[PDB]
Design a protein around this nucleic acid. Structure first.
Ligand SMILES: [Mg+2]
Ligand SMILES: [Mg+2]
Ligand SMILES: [Mg+2]
Length: 986
RNA sequence: GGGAAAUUAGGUGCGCUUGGCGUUUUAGUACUCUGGAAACAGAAUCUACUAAAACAAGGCAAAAUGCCGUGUUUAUCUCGUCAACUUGUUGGCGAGAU
DNA sequence: ATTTGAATAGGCAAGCC
DNA sequence: ATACGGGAAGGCTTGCCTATTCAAAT
DNA sequence: AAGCGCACCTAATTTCCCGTAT
């Protein structure tokens, strides 16, 4: 309005605090907090992963259907053909010698196409798979599982033989055989991506690459150069030489002729120039030359012309090798195109003086990736200036060279880290809302978190890097000498191999380096702490293990896995080994050791409270980025606003200095009262007055603004499927399963038998096996798991009752669980299912309150109740009227409001924020407190209730009102429309 | 003190391509019961294996290496104006109130 | 004096490598 | 013509069911 | 789990550029 002020900001992961202070007096004007859900990478990773899975399953289904059509066409399959009782492993093994029936033949081909193995980068090009598979079926009693992993080439070898034999007896031609093998072996590449129509797709390779690659600095509407173009490497070569300073008679910097002869005789002759070779061309001692790039080890480093040497080595024709424009084109193609057969065509279309022999050698070159920072346009501009003048690139480009509110799109271009992007978008929206309400600030301040590096630390880091380089160089040498393909995945495995003394950490069995190199697929990089639980992809959370061991461990810690019946070794043995490995100098890091020896119960939710891990301190680039965005904005529009930043640590100092304890468990206000300190900081530092901090500390009128989510088509329901059963009383119940029966510390079954023997299905259905199990529980009652002792003492799993001791092992036990109420019924996907097939956890969209003859009532609208149309979502009318009927809501009932997640609700005069509908049936809604989480409210009190609030909406309820806050946290009793919303455009 | 480029060491993100499982139903075989000299028939749906099918609810498409569906942004209401399709409602923009 | 209904508290489970 | 205040000392997830305790009605 | 493209960030090393305040 008129009064001038300062704007403090405490930007956070979940919050943006703000503080506003009179520029003259330094009295608090206002202060508040804007709270939001942390933007976790898990969320989108989920969405992407599931999109991937959906395509894999779609493509399998479509491949099976393409095969069927081919069998219909060659009249091997009909609508009325019996494929039901035909064991395809028998039919595969039979058909490699004898005639199959049309049905057996169809069974076999369909079985192959369903499951057709891996095809991996590793390969460049005595029994069959079906022979080995039938052998295991007979010996081990089973086929499917982790050991069922074969190469597609192994499957194609079988199919070709099957079709060679069968071609005689069935009428099928080479067209059939060619078609079938294509279906079987074929798949899309990473650079093809989806089919036509995809929002995620692309037309061709160049479109694909153009979309991805970055833009030039000095010429924005131009894509960068590829890293290894001749002019790009020659550019980098000249900058090195221009930086050189020599102590000689004559000019200290190099002259044109000297640079020319150096490039021609050193950089074009020698693959890796050395200071000696440059020193000889000048005819001056090495020590005279100073000002060169240095390797971490200490060697002088000079730019290497990649393409020149690569092509020269193939063919040294001066027509080719002394033509920059061609050497830039070849480079581009080699970077952009991916497969050799694509490169060959693209070179042949280039219309050059290269021969087909030469082209075929060019197409098998490696290491062409990445981009230079400039475009060719920018390089070809300045190349003459670098040739002649000993000038810096910046100097040459320097020589030759609306809005009302801060727009939120401008962050998008440069910040890309999901968490931070969200905090910043909120922060700009918060600043805009203040500038509107209070006019322009004099100063804006932001909490920077700077981390200066100590000298001793730098030295250690340098020493560490020096040590790491040596290991990497050796690994590279091993790959160079073994003749094996240089790969970014091989280096990691080799590093882990050396770290682990060439042993699998889970089995302690040897991983021979030679075997690792020849059969890399037998060994997998495992996460110590599951990726699904943690967010750690660091080397410290990675181990090299056998494929089989990785499959068995699953989403368990080493402790959980090695304590199970599935492990080859005991946890105690493992622990001893790890501790022994830790005794060495640079064997295993402390963090890795801790992960390997993690004994806490670590699941996806339990770990949330635990494991602060690597926090988001990486906001230095961000803080710089933000203030550059803001300063730019004010500068352009001519607004006198002084944007600043202060160090993270500094705030804490003033708190200790002025005796103002950072209050955990007191509420969200801490974020705001941090902001007010930032705003005063300068004044506080000058008067090393109690009165001003009295204002900050005694201030009360804080404001909170929780963000409200109204997005349709979020997760609808939980994935898991459940069978049901009607019990003795005629109550439909979910069927559960007890797994891990033979584990040391598992008392689930022993508890269940003592409490509720009648809950087991085998109590009713296999009484003889039940009585047989009860004798075990009685025998080894004293332990946690009677079955563990049964396995330990006798060495035999519990088998179903049989007269001749030939019943199968028992591995899971089904028992009756909870009663079935709120569910989604998916039973029509299972034709002739006797019982009901269901999913659980109907996830809420909103709830709509109604006032009916003085009685408050509400409807839950499920996400399932909302359906995408052309460009809008629609709440389903039939589902909605049905829902009102179960709630007995009259046609003469007044609609009050709709409550989304975090919407504000005043129930009997008490304000809360909405979480959801605890129970539709009982009419309960879960809420939370506004200024503090209810959990923390109870902790500060030292109360031991459950930390959840539930509110019943009933004839007892007296008033329900909806409230709303602006972004700043100004609170308003809000009005509603006459009817609920049905359409949602976005 | 800010910014830039090169090399090295180490991370993060977005997008794509595959494998093997897991959950559930139906069928077959084994397991248990009954009848039968035997082949086998009926019951039971427990415990195990193999096959086929489904896997966020669903929506397009039409023989195709077919395509989409769990992310992002997102106080509320009224009035003017433009747009959309559902034709009386909701999006964008501007103004006002809570 | 005993039985039934409503409110509050205890608690399990959630797709993967 | 040259240095830019520094050494100092923070998480909640929720949908929903079952079991236990108290007050009102038969 | 296998494996590919592009982008961005941190740290270390060498060189270059620029503005404001003491
Ligand atoms: Mg802070
Ligand atoms: Mg694993
Ligand atoms: Mg904070």
């Amino acid at each position: 309005m008129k009064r001038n002020y300062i704007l403090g900001l405490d930007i956070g992961i979940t919050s943006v605090g703000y503080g506003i202070i009179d520029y003259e007096t330094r009295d608090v004007i206002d202060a508040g907090v804007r709270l939001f859900k942390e933007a976790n990478v898990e969320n989108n990773e989920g969405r992407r992963s599931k999109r991937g899975a959906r395509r894999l399953k779609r493509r399998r289904r479509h491949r099976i259907q393409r095969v069927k059509k081919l069998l219909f066409d060659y009249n091997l399959l009909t609508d009325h053909s019996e494929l039901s009782g035909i064991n395809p492993y028998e039919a595969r093994v039979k058909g490699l010698s004898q005639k199959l029936s049309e049905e057996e033949f169809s069974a076999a081909l369909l079985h192959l196409a369903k499951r057709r193995g891996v095809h991996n980068v590793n390969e460049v090009e005595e029994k069959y798979v079906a022979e080995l598979q039938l052998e295991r079926l007979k010996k081990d009693g089973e086929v499917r599982g982790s050991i069922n992993r074969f190469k597609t080439s192994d499957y194609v070898k079988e199919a070709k033989q099957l079709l060679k034999v069968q071609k005689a007896y069935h009428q099928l031609d080479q067209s059939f055989i060619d078609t079938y093998i294509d279906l079987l072996e074929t798949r899309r590449t990473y650079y093809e991506g989806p089919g036509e129509g995809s929002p995620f797709g692309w037309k061709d390779i160049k479109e694909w690459y153009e979309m991805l690659m970055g833009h030039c600095t000095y010429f924005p509407e131009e894509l960068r150069s590829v890293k290894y173009a001749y002019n790009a490497d020659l550019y980098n070569a000249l900058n090195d030489l221009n930086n050189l300073v020599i102590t000689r008679d004559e000019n200290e910097k190099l002259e044109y002729y000297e640079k020319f002869q150096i490039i021609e005789n050193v950089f074009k002759q020698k693959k890796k120039p050395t200071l000696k070779q440059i020193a000889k061309e000048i005819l001056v001692n090495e020590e005279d030359i100073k000002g060169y790039r240095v390797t971490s080890t200490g060697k002088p480093e000079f730019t290497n012309l990649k393409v020149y040497h690569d092509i020269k080595d193939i063919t040294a024709r001066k027509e080719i090798i002394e033509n920059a424009e061609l050497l830039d084109q070849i480079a581009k193609i080699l970077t952009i195109y991916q497969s050799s057969e694509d490169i060959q065509e693209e070179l042949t279309n280039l219309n050059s003086e290269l021969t087909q022999e030469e082209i075929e050698q060019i197409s098998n070159l490696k290491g062409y990736t990445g981009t230079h920072n400039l475009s060719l346009k920018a390089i070809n501009l300045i190349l003459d200036e670098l040739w002649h003048t000993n000038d810096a690139q910046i100097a040459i480009f320097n020589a030759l060279k609306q809005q009302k509110e801060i727009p939120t799109t401008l962050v998008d271009d440069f910040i890309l880290s999901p968490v931070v992007k969200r905090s910043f978008i909120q922060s700009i929206k918060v600043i805009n809302a203040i500038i509107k309400k209070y006019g322009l600030p004099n100063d804006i301040i932001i909490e920077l978190a700077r981390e200066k590096n100590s000298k001793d630390a730098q030295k250690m880091i340098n020493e560490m890097q020096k040590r790491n380089r040596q290991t990497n160089e050796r690994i590279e040498e091993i790959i160079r000498t073994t003749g094996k393909e240089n790969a970014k995945y091989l280096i990691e495995k080799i590093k882990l191999h050396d770290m682990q003394e060439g042993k699998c950490l889970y089995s302690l069995e040897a991983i021979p380096l030679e075997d690792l190199l020849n059969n890399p697929f037998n060994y997998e990089v495992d996460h110590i702490i599951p990726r699904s639980v943690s967010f750690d992809n660091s080397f410290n959370n990675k181990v090299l293990v056998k494929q089989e061991e990785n499959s068995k461990k699953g989403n368990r810690t080493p402790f959980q896995y090695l304590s199970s019946s599935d492990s080859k070794i005991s946890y105690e043995t493992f622990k001893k080994h790890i501790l022994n490995l830790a005794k060495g100098k640079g064997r295993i890091s402390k963090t890795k050791k801790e992960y390997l020896l993690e004994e806490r119960d670590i699941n996806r939710f339990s770990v949330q409270k635990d494991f602060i891990n690597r926090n988001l301190v990486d906001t230095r680039y961000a803080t710089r980025g933000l203030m550059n965005l803001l300063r730019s904005y004010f500068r352009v529009n001519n607004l006198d606003v002084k944007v600043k930043s202060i160090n993270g640590g500094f705030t804490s100092f003033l708190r200790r200095k002025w005796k103002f304890k950072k209050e955990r468990n007191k509420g969200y206000k801490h974020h705001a009262e941090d902001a007010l300190i930032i705003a005063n900081a300068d004044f506080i530092f000058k008067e090393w007055t109690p009165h001003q901090i009295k204002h900050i500390k005694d201030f009360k009128d804080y404001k909170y603004s929780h963000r409200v989510d109204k997005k349709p088509n979020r997760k609808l329901i939980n994935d898991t499927l459940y069978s049901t059963r009607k019990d003795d009383k005629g109550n439909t119940r979910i069927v559960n399963n007890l797994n891990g029966l033979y584990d040391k510390d598992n008392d689930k079954l022993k508890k269940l038998i003592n409490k509720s023997p009648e809950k087991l299905l085998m109590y009713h259905h296999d009484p003889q096996t039940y009585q047989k199990l009860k004798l075990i529980m009685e025998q080894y009652g004293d332990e946690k798991n009677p079955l563990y002792k049964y396995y330990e003492e006798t060495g035999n799993y519990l088998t179903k009752y049989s007269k001749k001791d030939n019943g199968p092992v028992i591995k899971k036990i089904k028992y009756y669980g909870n009663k079935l109420n709120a569910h989604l019924d998916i039973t029509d996907d299972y034709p002739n299912s006797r019982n009901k097939v269901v999913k659980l956890s109907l996830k809420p969209y909103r709830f709509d309150v109604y006032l009916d003859n003085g009685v408050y009532k509400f409807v839950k609208v499920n996400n399932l109740d909302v359906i995408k149309k052309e460009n809008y979502y629609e709440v389903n009318s039939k589902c909605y009227e049905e829902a009102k009927k179960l709630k007995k809501i009259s046609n003469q009932a007044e609609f009050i409001a709709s409550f989304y997640r975090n919407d504000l609700i005043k129930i009997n005069g008490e304000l809360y924020r909405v979480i959801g509908v605890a129970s539709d049936l009982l009419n309960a809604i879960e809420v939370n407190m506004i200024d503090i989480t209810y959990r923390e409210y109870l902790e500060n009190m030292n109360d031991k209730r459950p930390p959840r609030i539930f509110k019943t909406i009933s004839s007892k309820t007296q008033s329900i009102k909806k409230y709303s806050t602006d972004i700043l946290g100004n609170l308003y009793e809000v009005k509603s429309k006459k009817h609920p919303q049905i359409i949602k455009k976005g």
